[PDB]
């Protein structure tokens, strides 16, 4: 909900998300929903963005409407 305001070229050349999947579209309280996919770090990383030497896998959401039980990059938490 925070995109559509960032620069178009910066959204185009930072990180490409594909093979995205969602385990469920509608859930109950205490029920788990899993989001999977791949992201590719673009070679032409803009100089105005620091290199992703320190990066955090986050979730874009309006406050803790979900709690992040687990998050993995590769296969490790």
Partner 1 sequence: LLDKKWLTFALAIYTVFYLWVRWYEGVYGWSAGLDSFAPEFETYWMNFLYTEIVLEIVTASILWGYLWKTRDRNLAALTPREELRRNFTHLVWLVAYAWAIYWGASYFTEQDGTWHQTIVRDTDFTPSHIIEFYLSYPIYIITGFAAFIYAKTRLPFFAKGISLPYLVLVVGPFMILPNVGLNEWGHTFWFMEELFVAPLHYGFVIFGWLALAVMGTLTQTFYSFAQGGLGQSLCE
Partner 2 sequence: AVRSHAEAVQVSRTIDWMALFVVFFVIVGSYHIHAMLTMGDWDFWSDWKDRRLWVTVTPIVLVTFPAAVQSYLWERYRLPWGATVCVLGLLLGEWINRYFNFWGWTYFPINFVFPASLVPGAIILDTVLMLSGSYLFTAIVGAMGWGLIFYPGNWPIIAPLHVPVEYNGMLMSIADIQGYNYVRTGTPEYIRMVEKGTLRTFGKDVAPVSAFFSAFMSILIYFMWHFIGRWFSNERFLQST
CB closer to its own copies, 46 vs 52: 46
69 labeled binding residue:
no
Tell me how many residues contact partner 2 (CB under 8 A): 29
Least CB distance from residue 25 to partner 2, whole Å? 19
Report how far residue 45's alpha carbon sits from residue 9's, in angstroms, rounded to the nearest whole number.
11
Site residues for its own copies per CB under 8 A: 43-48, 54
Burial of 14 (C-beta count, 10 Å sphere; 0-12/13-18/19+): middle
For the annotated binding site, the residues are: 1, 16, 40
């Amino acid at each position: 909900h925070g995109e559509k305001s960032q620069a178009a070229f910066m959204r185009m050349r930072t990180i490409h998300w594909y093979d995205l999947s969602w385990s469920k579209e509608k859930v109950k309280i205490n029920e788990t929903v899993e989001i999977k996919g791949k992201f590719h770090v673009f070679e032409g990383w803009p100089e105005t963005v620091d290199e992703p030497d320190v990066a955090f896998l986050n979730v874009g959401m309006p406050g803790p409407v979900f709690i992040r039980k687990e998050s993995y990059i590769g296969g490790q938490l």
